[PDB]
Subunit: 255 residues, 4 copies
C-alpha cells in the first residue's frame, strides 16, 4: 500500500560531491527538503556555501566543504568532515565528474584526467565511506554516470570509456557491498540544462538533440534529483547494481 | 526541491491488467492509495472483485473487469469499460503475462501462447488506449516484463524471447507515442514471491537464488509496486523507453 | 597454428532459406564454393532454381525447393526434402524474414506477420532440424537478425521487436541445444545493398546513413556471407549464443 | 563466393603484445602461419625469443621485443622497432593485460594497476600506431578484453571495470579511426586454459564453469586465435566497433 514515509529521507545523513551547481546542487536541495542532513561538497567553496544558505532558508540542515575529488587527501578529509558534522553517513551521492569531448590524439594527461574525475575518485570515496555505512547497518551509494557510457561517437574516447568504467563498477560493487547491506546504483542522464552543457551546446546542436528526443524537451536538474531521491529512498530497497537512464526516451549527442 | 505531491497519482485514472493477485494486486492497491481511480481487470472475476473491495475499504475508487488479455474482443471491451467508468485513462499498467519454463520440443501452440500473453496483448491494448491519452494530452504506459528478457538458460526459449520482445517494443513504442506526449517504460522483476514463483520454486532453488543476490532476500510485490508508482508519477516526467530491473542486484534463475 | 581446412565446409550439408536473392543467395554460393552441399529454398522457385544453376556452374552441389517459411507445412516439407536430397543436415541458415517499417496504428495482422517471418518460422524450423543434427553428432544453426534488434526509432515496433525476439531466442536456444552439440548464433547486419533495402532507401537517407558509418560505405551481401562462413565453420567451434553485428562500425537508420 | 586468400594475412605486418605465452602466443603463431610478418612483444624476453624460434621453424617471419606495455617509453620504442623491422604496421593486436580478482578494500595502487594494464596501455599504443596505419591507407586494431566487462560478481571491481572501459573504448575509437580507414574490434574470451586461468581455477570451480557452458568444455588459446584471424582479415572488412565473445555459449566465473 502507498506509504509516503518510504519516499522520504528523514534522519539520513548524505554526502554530495560537486553540489555547488547544476545537478548536484539540485540533488542536495531535494534531499535536504526530503528530510536528510547534507554535506555540500564542491571545489568552489563559495558555491558550496551558497547552497548551504539556501538549504537553511528552506529549513534544512547542511554543511559546506571544499573538496577536489581528484585528490585522495581531500577525499579523506571530506569523509572525516562529514562524520564529525553529521555523526554518521547513510548516503553518498557521487555526482562530481566530467571531462567532455576530446580528439583522439589528445595528450595522455587528458585521457587519464577523465578517469581521475569519473572512476578513481568515485571508487576511493566509496572505500572511505563503506565502513561507516557498514557500522550503521547499511547505506546507499549513487553515482551520476552518463548516456555516453552506452553511446558511440567521435571525439568521446576518454569521456565515454571512463563513464562506462564507472557504470560497470556500479554493477560489480553491488556484489562486494551487498553483504554490508549497502545498495549501489547510478543514473545516466541525457542532455540536462546546466552550465556544463551550455559550454558545449549550440542552437543547431540543440535542435538536432530535440529532434531525437520523444518527450520533446531538454532535461532539467530536477528530473535527475527526482530519480536520485527514489533510488536512495526506502522505496527502492531491492534496487541495486542498476543504472537508470533519464533521457526523455531519446539520445542527445553532439554529432 | 522535494514535493510529496509529485510522487502521487491524485486525479489520475489507471487500468491494471492481471490485478486480481500478486504484483498486479499490489500495484492496484498502491496506486489507489496514492490517489488514482483504478480499473482492476483479471481473468478471475472473484479475485478482481475482492481487490476492488479491499481498495474501497481503504477509501479508494475502483471498478472490476473480467478481461482475458488474450482476446482482442475483451481488450477493446476493457478499454470501453474503463473510459466509461473512469471518464478518461491516464495510465495503463500492462501486468498480466506469463508462460514459464518449457522444453525445446514443446508444441508450437505453447511457444505461440507466450507471445499472446507477453506481446500481442500488450501491443494491442496500447493501440486501444493511446488515442484516449492523446486526446487528453498525455499518458503513461508501463509493462511488467522480466529479467528473463536478459537472462540466458535452458528451458526458457518461449518465455525469455517473448519478454525480450516486450522490452524492445518499449524502447521503440516510446518513439511512436512520444509524439502524442506518452511515456512508455517497463519493469523487469527478478524472483518475486507470488503464487507464480511458488509454482516453480523449490527450497534448493531458493537457496541458489539467494546466494546470487547481493541484497540477500527475494523480492516482494511491494518492491515492484514502489517502482511502478515512481515510473508512472510526475516525478518521472522525462523518463521514457526504459526498463528498470528490480533484482536485489543479482540474478535468480531456475538453473 | 593456421589450418585452412577449419575454414572450409567440406562434406557439410546446409539448408538456406530465402536464398533466391540478396544475402541468402550469397550465403548459398559462398557455402557451396567452400565445400558444402546446399538446399536453396525460396518462395520464388524461379529465383531458387537460378541460384542452383550458378552453383552448379561453379562446380557445387545444390538443390532447389520452393518453401514459404510462414507455413509450418512447407517448413516440414523443406526439412523432408533436404534429408532425402542430402542424406543429412549439418547446418541451417535461417535467413528469410523481413516486415519492415510500419506505423504504430498498423492492423494487428501486420504486427503478427513480422513474428511469423522472424520468429515462429525460425523456431519451428530449428525444432524440425535439431533431431537430424543430433543424430549426426551436432550441427550449427545461424539466423540473420538485424541491427533493429538494438536500434530504437519510430515506425519500427513490429520489425524491431520481432528481430529482438529472434536474437534473444538465439541466446537461450544455445543452452537447450548445447547438450546435442549444436551451436546457435546470429548475424545482425546494418544496411546491406539488396533490393529489400532499395525498396526503402533514398539518396538523402543514403547520405545520412553514410554520415553515421565510420568505414564509409554501405554493406554488401558478401560481408554477411563471409561472417556466416566463419560462424558456421570449425574455426568457431566454441562460439555459440552470439550475435555478430556487421555494420561498418556505425548505425544506418531511416530516421 | 568463397576465397581462401581473403582469410589470410599474406603481406601484412602485425605487432602482438604479451605474445610470449597463452592466447598471445597462439595468435602470433596463427598469424605468422597465415602469412603475416610478426613482432612478438612480451615483458619476458626468453618467452618472446622462444616464440620467435617456433615461428621461424614453421617458416615464418618474426622479431622479438622486450616491451612492458605499462611504460609509455617502452610503448613508443615498440612502435619504432616494429616499423623499422617490419617496414610498416597493418595490424595491432593488443593482447597483454590482466589484473584479476581483488577485494573491495584493495590498495588504490592495485585498482589503478588494472587500468594501466587494460586501458591506458591499449589507448596509448593505438595513438602511436594510428598515424602509421593512416599513412598506409588503413589498418586493423584488435584488443583482447574479457567477459568480465559484462559479468557482475564479487571481488572483480578493478578487473571488470577496466575491461568494461576497454570494450567501450573500442566502440568509440571505431568512430575516430574510421576516418583514417582503420577498423577496431575486440574479443571477450570466457574461461581459456592458460597459466593465468590455472592460477585462480580449482577443480570445484572448473566443474561449475562447465555446468554453465552449453558447448561443454573450456576454451583454448586456438579458439581465440581463430576469431582474431577472422576479425583482422579482409573477410571482415566491414566489421568494426564490435566485441566478439568466445564462451561456448555460457558463463565461467569464480563465484
Ligand atoms: N549536464 C549534463 O548534460 C550531464 C551531466 N552528467 C554528469 O553530471 C555530473 C555533474 O555535471 P553538471 O551538473 O552538468 O555540471 P556543472 O558544471 O553544472 O556542475 C558541476 C559542479 O561540480 C563542481 N566540480 C568540478 N570539478 C570538481 C572537482 N574536481 N571536485 C569537486 N567538485 C567539482 C563544479 O564546480 C560545479 O559546481 C558530472 O558527473 C557529469 O559528467 C551526466 C550526463 C549529463
Ligand atoms: N513472480 C515473479 O517472480 C515475476 C513475475 N513477472 C511477471 O509479472 C506478471 C504478473 O505475475 P505474478 O504477479 O507473479 O502472477 P500471479 O499468478 O501471482 O498473478 C497473475 C494474475 O494474472 C491473472 N491473469 C492470468 N492470465 C490472465 C489473462 N489471460 N487475462 C487477464 N488476467 C490474467 C491471474 O488470474 C492472476 O490474478 C506476469 O507478466 C509475469 O510474467 C516478471 C518477473 C517475475
Ligand atoms: N538488406 C538489409 O539491409 C538487411 C536485411 N536483414 C535481414 O536479411 C534477411 C534477407 O533480406 P535481404 O537479403 O535483404 O532481402 P531480399 O529481398 O534481397 O531477399 C529476400 C529473399 O527471401 C525471399 N523470401 C521472401 N519471403 C519469403 C518467404 N515467406 N519464405 C521464403 N523465402 C522468402 C525473397 O523471395 C528473396 O529471394 C531478412 O531476414 C532481413 O530481415 C537484416 C539486416 C539488414
Ligand atoms: N586466460 C583467460 O581465461 C582469459 C584471458 N583474457 C585476457 O587475455 C590476455 C592474455 O591473457 P593470457 O593469455 O591468459 O595470459 P598468460 O599469462 O598466459 O600470458 C600473458 C603474457 O603476457 C605477458 N605480459 C604480462 N605483462 C606484460 C606487460 N606488462 N608487458 C608486456 N607483456 C606482458 C606475460 O609475460 C605472458 O607471456 C589478458 O589481457 C587477459 O586479461 C581474457 C579472458 C580470458
Ligand atoms: C562538456 C561537459 C564536461 C565539462 C567538464 O567537466 N570538463 C560534459 C559533461 C556532461 C556531458 C554530456 C552528457 O554526458 C550527456 C550527453 C552524452 C552524449 O554521449 C554526448 C552529448 C552529451 C549532451 C554530453 C556533452 C558533454 C557534457 C556536457
Ligand atoms: C512459472 C511462471 C509463469 C506461470 C504462468 O504464467 N503459467 C513464471 C512467471 C514469472 C517467472 C520468473 C521471472 O520472470 C523471474 C525469473 C527470471 C529468470 O530468467 C528465471 C527465474 C524467474 C524466477 C522466473 C521463473 C518462472 C516464473 C515464476
Ligand atoms: C524493408 C525491408 C523489409 C521488406 C520485407 O521483407 N517486407 C527491411 C528488411 C531489412 C531492413 C533494414 C535492416 O534491418 C537494417 C537497418 C536497421 C535499422 O533499424 C533501420 C534501417 C535498416 C536499413 C532496415 C530498413 C528496412 C529493411 C530494408
Ligand atoms: C587471474 C588472471 C590475471 C592474472 C594477472 O594478470 N595477474 C585473470 C585474467 C583472465 C581472467 C579470467 C577472464 O577474464 C575470463 C573469466 C571472466 C569472469 O568474469 C571471471 C572468471 C574468468 C575465468 C577470469 C578469471 C581471472 C583471470 C584468469
Amino acid at each position: 500500500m502507498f506509504n509516503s514515509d518510504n519516499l522520504r529521507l528523514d534522519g539520513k545523513c548524505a554526502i554530495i560531491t560537486g553540489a555547488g551547481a547544476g545537478i548536484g546542487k539540485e540533488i542536495a536541495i531535494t534531499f535536504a527538503t526530503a528530510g536528510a542532513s547534507v554535506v555540500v561538497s564542491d571545489i568552489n567553496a563559495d558555491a558550496a556555501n551558497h547552497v548551504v544558505d539556501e538549504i537553511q532558508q528552506l529549513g534544512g540542515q547542511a554543511f559546506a566543504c571544499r573538496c577536489d575529488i581528484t585528490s585522495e587527501q581531500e577525499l579523506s578529509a571530506l569523509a572525516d568532515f562529514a562524520i564529525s558534522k553529521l555523526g554518521k553517513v547513510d548516503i553518498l551521492v557521487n555526482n562530481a565528474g566530467g571531462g567532455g569531448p576530446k580528439p583522439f590524439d589528445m595528450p595522455m594527461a587528458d585521457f587519464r584526467r577523465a578517469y581521475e574525475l569519473n572512476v578513481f575518485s568515485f571508487f576511493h570515496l566509496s572505500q572511505l565511506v563503506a565502513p561507516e555505512m557498514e557500522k550503521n547497518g547499511g547505506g546507499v551509494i549513487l553515482t551520476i554516470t552518463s548516456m555516453a557510457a552506452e553511446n558511440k561517437n567521435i571525439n568521446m574516447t576518454s569521456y565515454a570509456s571512463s563513464k562506462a568504467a564507472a557504470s560497470h563498477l556500479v554493477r560489480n560493487m553491488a556484489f562486494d557491498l551487498g553483504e554490508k547491506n549497502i545498495r549501489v546504483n547510478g543514473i545516466a542522464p541525457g542532455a540536462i540544462l546546466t552550465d556544463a552543457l551550455k559550454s558545449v551546446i549550440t542552437p543547431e546542436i540543440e535542435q538536432k538533440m530535440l529532434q531525437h528526443t520523444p518527450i520533446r524537451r531538454l532535461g532539467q536538474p530536477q528530473d535527475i534529483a527526482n530519480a536520485a531521491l527514489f533510488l536512495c529512498s526506502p522505496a527502492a530497497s531491492w534496487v541495486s547494481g542498476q543504472i537508470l537512464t533519464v533521457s526523455g526516451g531519446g539520445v542527445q549527442e553532439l554529432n
